Amino acid sequence: CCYKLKPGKQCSPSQGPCCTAHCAFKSKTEKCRDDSDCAKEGICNGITALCPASDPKPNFTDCNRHTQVCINGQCAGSICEKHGLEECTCKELCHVCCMKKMEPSTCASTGSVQWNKYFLGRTITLQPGSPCNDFRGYCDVFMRCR
């Protein structure tokens, strides 16, 4: 009902979530992107009909249910990376196991006596859909691999 654009019109909602039904940029205070694990909510800037970027939350912020961490506004890596450790395979295949680097001898679940100083003995399980067993399968809703 706006558009090119008719005279006097600033934009058409089609071009983005920051345009009123009446073809005008929304205020530099309107929300256009819901919050997120790693990203903050998006606000319009009142100058364009596009919804701007979205500032990222601190880096080692938990995401995907304590399963992973936030890296540059993206849920990546593994929760193990928050504490200097590395994810390793532990059935218990969809449990999160960590180890000190280069030392597979140390590979233990998050809810073990060691690691307690980090996970307070909580046995974190991989989210269904996650990779498992050295990228050989994925985790079911049944917590089974492949």
Curated annotation (Swiss-Prot):
<feature type="disulfide bond">
    <location>
        <begin position="132"/>
        <end position="145"/>
    </location>
</feature>
<feature type="glycosylation site" description="N-linked (GlcNAc...) asparagine">
    <location>
        <position position="59"/>
    </location>
</feature>
<protein>
    <recommendedName>
        <fullName>Disintegrin and metalloproteinase domain-containing protein 10</fullName>
    </recommendedName>
</protein>
<comment type="subunit">
    <text>Forms a ternary EFNA5-EPHA3-ADAM10 complex mediating EFNA5 extracellular domain shedding by ADAM10 which regulates the EFNA5-EPHA3 complex internalization and function, the cleavage occurs in trans, with ADAM10 and its substrate being on the membranes of opposing cells. Interacts with the clathrin adapter AP2 complex subunits AP2A1, AP2A2, AP2B1, and AP2M1; this interaction facilitates ADAM10 endocytosis from the plasma membrane during long-term potentiation in hippocampal neurons.</text>
</comment>
<feature type="disulfide bond">
    <location>
        <begin position="90"/>
        <end position="97"/>
    </location>
</feature>
<feature type="disulfide bond">
    <location>
        <begin position="32"/>
        <end position="51"/>
    </location>
</feature>
<feature type="disulfide bond">
    <location>
        <begin position="18"/>
        <end position="44"/>
    </location>
</feature>
<feature type="disulfide bond">
    <location>
        <begin position="63"/>
        <end position="75"/>
    </location>
</feature>
<feature type="disulfide bond">
    <location>
        <begin position="94"/>
        <end position="139"/>
    </location>
</feature>
<feature type="disulfide bond">
    <location>
        <begin position="11"/>
        <end position="19"/>
    </location>
</feature>
<feature type="domain" description="Disintegrin">
    <location>
        <begin position="1"/>
        <end position="59"/>
    </location>
</feature>
<feature type="disulfide bond">
    <location>
        <begin position="1"/>
        <end position="23"/>
    </location>
</feature>
<feature type="disulfide bond">
    <location>
        <begin position="80"/>
        <end position="98"/>
    </location>
</feature>
<feature type="disulfide bond">
    <location>
        <begin position="88"/>
        <end position="107"/>
    </location>
</feature>
<comment type="function">
    <text>Transmembrane metalloprotease which mediates the ectodomain shedding of a myriad of transmembrane proteins, including adhesion proteins, growth factor precursors and cytokines being essential for development and tissue homeostasis. Associates with six members of the tetraspanin superfamily TspanC8 which regulate its exit from the endoplasmic reticulum and its substrate selectivity. Cleaves the membrane-bound precursor of TNF-alpha at '76-Ala-|-Val-77' to its mature soluble form. Responsible for the proteolytical release of soluble JAM3 from endothelial cells surface.</text>
</comment>
<feature type="disulfide bond">
    <location>
        <begin position="38"/>
        <end position="70"/>
    </location>
</feature>
